Amino acid sequence: SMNPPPPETSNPNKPKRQTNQLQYLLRVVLKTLWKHQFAWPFQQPVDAVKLNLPDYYKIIKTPMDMGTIKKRLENNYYWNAQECIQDFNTMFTNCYIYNKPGDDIVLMAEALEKLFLQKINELPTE
Amino acid sequence: MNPPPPETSNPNKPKRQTNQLQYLLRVVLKTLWKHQFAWPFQQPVDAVKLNLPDYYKIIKTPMDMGTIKKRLENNYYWNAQECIQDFNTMFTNCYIYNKPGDDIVLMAEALEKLFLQKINELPTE
Q1: How far is B67 from chain A (nearest CA, A)?
Q2: At which residues is the cross-link Glycyl lysine isopeptide (Lys-Gly) (interchain with G-Cter in SUMO2) found (chain A)?
């Protein structure tokens, strides 16, 4: 029933680089999704204890949230833009996995995913 | 606490069935209901669930698509403009409660654009 530690956000062993794509993922994609009116359930790790969801971390074994993605971008945790895109995709699919089609939280996640994809469509060239 | 939803049946008002009112239900309501952006507008805002204690302090004329649907089905509207006014109230309530450029406002603006495209083909009176 207890929450796991949050995902790691710093990797001292891993080389760092700053690219136009990674800058855009933080300053455009993360920032835009963060300020969306539907963003609140996704801004921090699911507190399954406080929300009374004892089965959440039995079902969701690869948790991800926007606060973690923000920290990973800030800490240069990602070398390839695709690692960051994968984390966003994990966050959305975790919502679809844990919940059921038509739940409001799912409709919120779907709207964020569609906006996310629109912003990714304009990712700077590699 | 949320207010009661808007009234949708008026036992005193006479009733009529017109091409414009049919179109508003069968075409306009139907098309808007199925838009990707429609769900936040399909029922009254549940300000208790969303923890928005200020919503019904700011929005004193609430309106939503489910109420419009019911009003059309119950012949609550005599004039098509009464129904058009309700859609317009729905959209402006979003602009009033929120701020320019908010994502929810952009959603309402897209629904309003579609609404106006459909109203442009409303049958004549």
Answers
A1: 19
A2: 58
The amino acid occupying position B44 is P
Domain span at residue A117 reads 19-123
State the helix-helix crossing angle for B80-97 and B65-73, rounded to 10 degrees: 170
Q: Is residue B5 part of a domain?
A: no
Closest among B22, B13, B37 to B83, alpha carbons compared: B22
Cross-chain CB nearest to A37 (options B37, B39, B104): B104
**For chain A, how many residues are written?**
126
A105 lies within 8 A of chain B by CB: no
Experimental structure resolution, Å: 1.4
B3: in domain: no
Best A35, A36, A37, A113 residue to mutate vs chain B (most B CBs within 10 Å) = A37
Rounded to a whole number, what is the distance in Å from the CA of B92 to chain A's nearest CA? 17
Q: Answer whether residue A77 is part of any domain.
A: yes
| Method of determination used here | X-ray
Total of domains in chain B: 1
